[PDB]
């Protein structure tokens, strides 16, 4: 599921990861979190807010 960061974000949590406005992630599932995805970047998978990205499945 093609992910696209709409804004500049930095991880808050330890299970979360950073992305800059424009990174293309890889949304490797979602479960219960109806506000957070579990996508991939920079060889690290982590939580990212659904409100900070524009998805395209």
């Amino acid at each position: 599921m093609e992910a696209i960061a709409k804004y500049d974000f930095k991880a808050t949590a330890d299970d979360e990861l950073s992305f800059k406005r424009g990174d293309i992630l890889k949304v490797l599932n979602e479960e219960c979190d109806q506000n957070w995805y579990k996508a991939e970047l920079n060889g690290k998978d982590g939580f990212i807010p659904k409100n900070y990205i524009e998805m395209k499945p």
Binding site: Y7, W36, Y52
Partner: peptide, 10 residues
């Protein structure tokens, strides 16, 4: 001015 991040509980 990016959005207010959701209150998570992961």
């Amino acid at each position: 001015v990016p959005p207010p991040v959701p209150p998570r509980r992961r």
